[PDB]
């Protein structure tokens, strides 16, 4: 009825969205938490990973206090864009997407006491630097870091709504990983001293361990069998010169094909991995057999 | 604007990553978070034993030196974070900054340039492109220690070494 439209129209009267709540007299405190709907694919070629998140923040803006029979007020996106919201951004993000189908996938609730709750659905691609020394036996801790872009530590501070461990909740079905196993998450907070000032950074670390069975069946085991053929060369009689020459040289060719195939499906790394050292030793063994 | 960019965008999640900070004296700080693909003409004739030289050029679109001047704030410390970069395949040997006025015929226009000198890392190529070729070339010499009459053995060895070199070359062309 008329009360809703009247309260909606009269909230923004004299509201300046260019200024944060409590500017110059307190620090805007933002309680944040995340529900990971799916931990997307991890592209070790690009050293990135995708994550789909319901990312919801909450703060207090006494400028938007109101009174009425209703304790909760839903704001449409046109009005939700007309007030101050935190300028949260992901420090290690590469290309993130704010979902808009069928309408902007975001919501803004206001309590009678002026508490704002702002929920968004996001798909974030984020950098995951990797130490591939022990590949394919390696494990990684891919980070997800976010914070205010413009407001320093003395203006906006982020916090976790609940205990930090329980403030990042991963869905039971939300592990869309083929290569890795998502062992768990570690949630933390910190400070970054940038060229513009100090900033609070809320971080999560998703711990991933690569699966090894594929590389055992595709690369290690056939290479070991090729080497075993190279030693089986020794048990033929020495007078079978063409047989043993063909055996050795074709085993070398087989090892070369295996090495090429093993590496072709891997990220373009400079230094050598454990797979590379195993393959090199297998080369050395077949060459030495010949 | 960046003269040598090909595709650039300001990040826009959760909001447009812009920053306006006004200081009492009148100074204005304008910050952006930009991911840009920038052209870098590479001379790969010495590849993979090659050093590349990739620059980012910063210019004013429609102002001359009589209307605007650029400078690197903080001098050589203007650009930060290069020391913390580790590319998968390169290693940033050095980075440099230069400010200069391009004297274009109508008038002089300001310009800044941030250069990086990348040096390629070779352990990949040494362990994988050079080692098997060297080993196969060495194996091809085994034929000289086999008797002349052993035609099948020497022929099989030589031609299969040729086939292995062909396989290495073709598949390395495909991968590289």
């Amino acid at each position, epitope marked *: 009825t008329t009360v809703f439209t009247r309260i909606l129209d009269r909230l923004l009267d004299g509201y300046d969205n260019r200024l944060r709540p409590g500017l110059g007299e307190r620090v805007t405190e933002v309680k944040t938490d995340i529900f990971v709907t799916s931990f997307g694919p991890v592209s070790d070629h690009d050293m990135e990973y995708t994550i789909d998140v319901f990312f919801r923040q909450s703060w207090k803006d006494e400028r938007l206090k109101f009174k009425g029979p209703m304790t909760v007020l839903r704001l449409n996106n046109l009005m939700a864009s007309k007030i101050w919201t935190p300028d949260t951004f992901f*420090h*290690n993000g590469k290309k993130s997407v704010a979902h808009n189908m069928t309408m902007p996938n975001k919501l803004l609730r206001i309590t009678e006491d002026g508490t704002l709750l702002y929920t968004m659905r996001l798909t974030v691609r984020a950098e995951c*630097p990797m*130490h591939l020394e022990d590949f394919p036996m390696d*494990a*990684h*801790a891919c*980070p997800l*870091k976010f914070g205010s872009y413009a407001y320093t530590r003395a203006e906006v501070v982020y916090e976790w709504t609940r205990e930090p461990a329980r403030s990042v909740v991963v869905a039971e079905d939300g592990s869309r990983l083929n290569q890795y196993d998502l*062992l*768990g998450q*570690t949630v*933390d*907070s*910190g*400070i*970054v*001293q*940038s060229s513009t000032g100090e900033y609070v*950074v809320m*971080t999560t*670390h998703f*711990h991933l361990k690569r699966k090894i069975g594929y590389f055992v069946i595709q690369t290690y085991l056939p290479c070991i069998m090729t080497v075993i053929l190279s030693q089986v060369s020794f048990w033929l009689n020495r007078e079978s010169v063409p047989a043993r020459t063909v055996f050795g040289v074709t085993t070398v060719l087989t090892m070369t094909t295996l090495s090429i195939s093993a590496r072709n499906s891997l990220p373009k790394v400079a230094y050598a991995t454990a797979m590379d050292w195993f393959i090199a030793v297998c080369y050395a063994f077949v060459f030495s057999a010949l | 604007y960046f003269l040598n960019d090909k595709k650039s965008f300001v990040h826009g999640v959760t909001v447009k990553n812009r920053m306006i900070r006004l200081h009492p004296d009148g100074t204005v700080l304008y910050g952006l978070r930009i991911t840009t693909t920038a052209a870098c003409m590479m001379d790969l004739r010495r590849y993979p034993l090659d050093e590349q030289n990739c620059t980012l050029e910063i210019e004013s679109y429609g102002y001359t030196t009589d209307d605007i001047e650029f400078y690197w704030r903080g001098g050589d410390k203007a650009v930060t974070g290069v*020391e*913390r*970069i*580790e590319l998968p395949q390169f290693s940033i040997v050095e980075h440099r900054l230069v400010s200069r006025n391009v004297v274009f015929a109508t008038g002089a226009y300001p310009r800044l340039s941030l250069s990086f000198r990348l040096k390629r890392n070779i352990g990949y190529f040494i362990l994988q492109t050079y080692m098997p070729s060297i080993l196969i070339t060495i194996l091809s010499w085994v034929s000289f220690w086999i008797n002349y009459d052993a035609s099948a053995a020497r022929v099989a060895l030589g031609i299969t070494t040729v086939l292995t070199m062909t396989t290495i070359n073709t598949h390395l062309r495909e991968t590289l």
Partner: nanobody
Amino acid sequence: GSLRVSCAASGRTFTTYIMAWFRQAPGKEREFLAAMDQGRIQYYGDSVRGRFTISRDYAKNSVDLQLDGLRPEDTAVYYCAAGAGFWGLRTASSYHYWGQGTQVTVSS
């Protein structure tokens, strides 16, 4: 008093690794103090939040800890650690590299 403890790493470049400081008072209990990341993000323990400051010189491949507001109870052996933080960033088990350590004592 005020003090500064530096840590210089040799044999490997820890540009992409997390470099941290740990403390061990008498009694055999190792305590996380501070850590700094490739992204220059500083994590601190609650006991020493706002007192100790951690910085990294990536060009020199070193990590420094400025200690301020020392107290008699801060006497301990301080260890420098490096390594990617897997299951960690606050647990000593996640760090593969450690140093000899440095003794600190404060008298009142």
